Amino acid sequence: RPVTVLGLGAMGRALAGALVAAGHPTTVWNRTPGRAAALTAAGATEAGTAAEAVAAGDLVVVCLLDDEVTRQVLALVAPVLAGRTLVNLTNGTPEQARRLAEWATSHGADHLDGGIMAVPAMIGQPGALILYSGPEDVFRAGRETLAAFGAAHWLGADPGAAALHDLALLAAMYGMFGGYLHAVAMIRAAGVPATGFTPLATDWLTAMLGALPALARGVDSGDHAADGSAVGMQAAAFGNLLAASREGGVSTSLLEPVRRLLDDAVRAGHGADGLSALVDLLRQS
Amino acid sequence: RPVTVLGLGAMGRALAGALVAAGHPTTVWNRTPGRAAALTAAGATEAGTAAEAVAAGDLVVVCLLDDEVTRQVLALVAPVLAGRTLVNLTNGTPEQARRLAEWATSHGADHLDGGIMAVPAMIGQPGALILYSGPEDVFRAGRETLAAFGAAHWLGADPGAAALHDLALLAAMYGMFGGYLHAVAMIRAAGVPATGFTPLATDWLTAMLGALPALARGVDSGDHAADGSAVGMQAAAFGNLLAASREGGVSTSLLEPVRRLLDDAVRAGHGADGLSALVDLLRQS
Ligand SMILES: NC(=O)c1ccc[n+]([C@@H]2O[C@H](COP(=O)([O-])OP(=O)(O)OC[C@H]3O[C@@H](n4cnc5c(N)ncnc54)[C@H](OP(=O)(O)O)[C@@H]3O)[C@@H](O)[C@H]2O)c1
Ligand SMILES: NC(=O)c1ccc[n+]([C@@H]2O[C@H](COP(=O)([O-])OP(=O)(O)OC[C@H]3O[C@@H](n4cnc5c(N)ncnc54)[C@H](OP(=O)(O)O)[C@@H]3O)[C@@H](O)[C@H]2O)c1
């Protein structure tokens, strides 16, 4: 398939470069000129307009700054989208992806949302993960092209499924990193190097990953059975963590929300339950 | 060695039970009577006073509610601590452990601080982890007794080292769990079960654990080189996570501190650096 990339920022250039290096006939476009020098040198074709670029591709890959820019560029190319497949690799929300699917359908185009789980430099390597959602046959017809970026993981027909899982994985990653970064700040304040702490932390967190299936079972079942590590005891043990942080001059900012959630769970009567009881406490609607 | 346990709450009873089942001559004490029925039935001896219990053991294991209770009980038994080794398995802070080491030395006793990384039910199984710190020979003379509880990991001569690493590991665990719990709340609000999400999350977080060595290298070196995933882009991508959470009626409480830290890092000029630059931003002293 001939392919088109709209957007030549850091990620867009990596995307186009992976397509070129795989042999796909690739046409690229970007608002600001001078971003396709190496791409054109390697075999790509730089269109002068987005509509031109779109007309030269059966599969249109979009990677712009945000969903608002995306919707603006696409509105300009709406008359030419008919019969093509739109693959939005711009980051966005699940609802924005579902709205784009309906809008694309209104202009005769297929649609897939994508959430890139890798850095630009990893694009094109088999370990690079990109999540996709949308109609299964649309993914099927395009997956060999998407494989140029790395692994292509179809999550389901819901157009918003890729963005949902992308952002949820990011939430899990930022939680883990925030806890690790607080931990290293505590040991740094005591003069202990972070390099020697990493094996202990990795072994520990690897062990903690084994607690996830039981947590998920409790969430889905509503049976918040404890694995001996109950909310009430964990709430009682958090205070030493806060005090030791203050002892070392380390801010408690990263830890306060978990403390409050634990205290709120105890107030709600969940002291004898496991952490699966914490999930529905995050509901605000 | 004859051993003594002070404190028969959930953890203290598990500790004493592991000692009994290993064959150690065990003497136990507790403030409230009636907590040693099964222990005495299995071969333990219940002393009527803490001082009695202490006098019947060369190694005194303490597991009370908190450091304030610990210091009160011990003050009463100070005249009889001479020549014994004190192993405090009550949770506490690094400074409290260092102060107890000095106080114990003042009464002719050796001292080890311990931080229990396992649940009461796992005490006695080889996978149960307890961290220890204090003089290396004191640990050596006692480690075969400590092995009744599970693995005994000596972290160094600093009496506060076990509590420091214990609490740092807890910070990493609570960060990871908070991120996971937010993630499952997002997918739950979309009607997706947590059970099917767990493999993706475990694979993802296992991959993320591979980023730790580079982070630790940057912290120790002060060279906050980016792995392509720079602070500025991660700050720009966090907003979609917040918006998607609001879309699903999910509180953003667990995520706000990481957002603020990222924004603060950008303000401080670290937008092109990796997350290792975030550590020294947590300093308040
Ligand atoms: N890079 C990563 O590490 C990473 C990881 C995962 C996913 N992503 C996602 O990839 C997407 C792009 O990131 P990036 O690294 O490529 O960012 P970037 O380097 O800042 O590039 C932004 C792109 O948007 C274009 N653009 C901005 N405003 C525009 C407008 N008004 N009209 C038309 N085009 C406009 C820019 O074109 P000009 O050259 O004309 O400014 C440029 O091509 C984002 O949605 C991001 O979340 C990135
Ligand atoms: N359990 C866990 O999951 C877990 C995990 C890691 C570490 N730990 C640590 O283990 C320690 C004990 O936890 P636990 O589960 O045993 O708690 P617990 O079941 O609440 O037991 C608390 C103990 O403290 C005693 N105590 C309280 N106030 C006292 C006082 N004024 N004078 C004398 N004794 C007093 C109680 O004796 P009475 O029977 O007379 O009240 C009881 O033996 C804590 O430091 C905790 O952080 C526990």
Side-chain angles (χ1 to χ4, degrees), chain A residues 6 13 42-43 45 72 78 92 104-105 110 113 117 120 130-131 138 171 181 192 223 225-226 242 246-247 268 272 276:
Chain A
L6 297 182
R13 290 194 307 279
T45 294
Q72 150 199 291
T105 293
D110 289 336
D113 187 60
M117 297 330 280
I130 301 189
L131 312 177
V138 173
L181 291 171
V192 177
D223 189 340
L242 297 176
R246 308 183 156 92
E247 277 178 9
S276 66

Coordinates of all heavy atoms in Angstrom, one line a residue, chain A residues 6 13 42-43 45 72 78 92 104-105 110 113 117 120 130-131 138 171 181 192 223 225-226 242 246-247 268 272 276:
Chain A
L6 N 1.1 12.6 7.9 CA 0.8 14.0 8.1 C 1.4 14.4 9.5 O 0.9 14.0 10.5 CB -0.7 14.3 8.1 CG -1.4 14.0 6.8 CD1 -2.9 14.4 6.9 CD2 -0.8 14.8 5.6
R13 N 8.5 12.0 12.0 CA 9.7 11.7 11.2 C 10.1 10.3 11.5 O 10.5 9.6 10.5 CB 10.8 12.7 11.5 CG 10.6 14.1 11.1 CD 11.9 14.9 11.1 NE 12.6 14.9 12.4 CZ 12.3 15.6 13.4 NH1 11.3 16.5 13.4 NH2 13.0 15.5 14.6
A42 N 16.0 9.6 1.4 CA 15.9 8.1 1.5 C 14.8 7.5 0.7 O 14.7 6.3 0.7 CB 15.7 7.8 3.0
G43 N 14.1 8.3 -0.1 CA 13.1 7.7 -1.0 C 11.7 8.3 -0.8 O 10.8 7.9 -1.6
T45 N 8.6 11.2 -0.7 CA 8.1 12.3 -1.5 C 7.4 13.3 -0.6 O 6.4 12.9 0.1 CB 7.1 11.8 -2.6 OG1 7.9 10.9 -3.5 CG2 6.5 12.9 -3.3
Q72 N -8.1 20.2 12.8 CA -8.1 21.3 11.8 C -7.5 20.8 10.5 O -8.1 21.1 9.4 CB -7.2 22.4 12.4 CG -6.5 23.3 11.4 CD -5.3 24.0 11.9 OE1 -5.5 25.0 12.7 NE2 -4.1 23.6 11.6
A78 N -11.0 16.9 4.2 CA -12.2 16.1 4.2 C -12.7 15.7 2.8 O -13.1 14.5 2.7 CB -13.3 16.8 5.0
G92 N -4.3 11.3 22.3 CA -5.6 11.9 22.5 C -6.3 11.1 23.6 O -5.8 10.1 24.2
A104 N -14.8 10.7 10.5 CA -14.2 10.0 9.3 C -15.3 9.2 8.5 O -15.3 9.3 7.3 CB -13.1 9.1 9.8
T105 N -16.1 8.5 9.2 CA -17.2 7.7 8.5 C -18.1 8.7 7.7 O -18.5 8.3 6.6 CB -18.0 7.0 9.6 OG1 -17.2 5.9 10.1 CG2 -19.2 6.3 8.9
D110 N -12.4 5.0 6.5 CA -12.2 4.1 7.6 C -11.3 4.8 8.6 O -10.7 5.8 8.4 CB -11.6 2.8 7.1 CG -12.5 1.9 6.3 OD1 -13.7 2.1 6.5 OD2 -12.1 1.1 5.5
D113 N -7.7 4.3 15.7 CA -6.9 5.1 16.6 C -5.7 4.3 17.0 O -5.7 3.1 17.2 CB -7.7 5.6 17.8 CG -6.9 6.6 18.7 OD1 -6.5 7.6 18.1 OD2 -6.7 6.3 19.8
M117 N 3.4 3.6 22.3 CA 4.0 3.2 23.6 C 5.5 3.2 23.6 O 6.1 2.6 24.5 CB 3.4 1.9 24.1 CG 1.9 1.8 24.4 SD 1.1 3.3 24.9 CE 1.6 3.3 26.7
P120 N 10.5 7.8 19.9 CA 10.8 7.9 18.4 C 12.0 7.0 18.0 O 11.9 6.4 16.9 CB 11.2 9.4 18.3 CG 10.2 10.1 19.2 CD 10.2 9.2 20.4
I130 N 2.8 -0.3 19.7 CA 1.7 0.7 19.4 C 0.4 -0.1 19.5 O 0.2 -1.2 19.0 CB 1.9 1.3 18.0 CG1 3.2 2.0 17.9 CG2 0.7 2.2 17.7 CD1 3.4 2.8 16.6
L131 N -0.5 0.5 20.2 CA -1.9 0.0 20.4 C -2.8 0.5 19.4 O -2.8 1.7 19.1 CB -2.4 0.3 21.9 CG -1.4 0.0 23.0 CD1 -2.0 0.4 24.3 CD2 -1.0 -1.5 23.1
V138 N -10.5 -3.4 9.3 CA -9.7 -2.2 8.9 C -8.3 -2.4 9.5 O -7.3 -2.1 8.8 CB -10.3 -0.9 9.5 CG1 -9.4 0.2 9.3 CG2 -11.7 -0.6 8.8
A171 N -0.7 5.8 33.4 CA -1.0 6.0 34.8 C -0.2 5.0 35.7 O 0.3 5.4 36.7 CB -2.5 5.9 35.0
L181 N 11.1 7.2 42.3 CA 11.9 8.4 42.4 C 11.8 9.0 43.9 O 12.8 9.5 44.4 CB 11.3 9.5 41.5 CG 11.5 9.2 40.0 CD1 10.7 10.2 39.2 CD2 13.0 9.3 39.7
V192 N 23.3 7.1 50.3 CA 23.4 5.7 49.7 C 23.2 5.9 48.2 O 22.2 6.6 47.8 CB 22.3 4.8 50.3 CG1 22.4 3.4 49.6 CG2 22.5 4.6 51.8
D223 N -15.6 -8.7 45.7 CA -15.1 -9.4 47.0 C -13.7 -8.9 47.3 O -12.7 -9.5 46.8 CB -15.2 -10.9 46.8 CG -15.0 -11.7 48.1 OD1 -14.4 -11.1 49.1 OD2 -15.4 -12.8 48.2
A225 N -11.5 -9.4 49.4 CA -10.7 -10.2 50.4 C -9.3 -9.8 50.5 O -8.7 -9.4 49.5 CB -10.8 -11.7 49.9
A226 N -8.8 -9.8 51.7 CA -7.4 -9.3 52.0 C -6.4 -10.5 51.9 O -6.8 -11.7 52.2 CB -7.3 -8.7 53.4
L242 N 6.1 8.7 55.9 CA 6.1 10.1 55.9 C 7.1 10.7 56.8 O 7.8 11.7 56.5 CB 4.7 10.6 56.2 CG 3.6 10.1 55.3 CD1 2.2 10.6 55.8 CD2 3.8 10.7 53.9
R246 N 10.4 13.2 56.0 CA 10.7 14.4 56.7 C 12.1 14.4 57.4 O 12.8 15.4 57.3 CB 9.6 14.8 57.7 CG 8.2 14.8 57.0 CD 7.1 15.2 58.0 NE 6.0 15.7 57.2 CZ 4.9 14.9 56.9 NH1 4.7 13.7 57.5 NH2 4.1 15.3 56.0
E247 N 12.4 13.3 58.0 CA 13.7 13.1 58.6 C 14.8 13.4 57.6 O 15.8 14.1 57.9 CB 13.9 11.7 59.2 CG 13.2 11.5 60.5 CD 13.4 10.1 61.0 OE1 14.1 9.3 60.4 OE2 12.8 9.8 62.1
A268 N -14.4 4.7 55.4 CA -15.5 4.1 54.7 C -15.8 2.7 55.2 O -16.7 2.0 54.7 CB -15.2 4.1 53.2
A272 N -10.4 -3.8 56.9 CA -10.1 -5.2 56.9 C -10.0 -5.8 55.5 O -9.7 -7.0 55.3 CB -11.1 -6.0 57.7
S276 N -8.1 -3.8 46.6 CA -9.1 -3.8 45.6 C -10.3 -2.9 46.0 O -11.0 -2.4 45.1 CB -9.6 -5.2 45.3 OG -10.2 -5.8 46.4

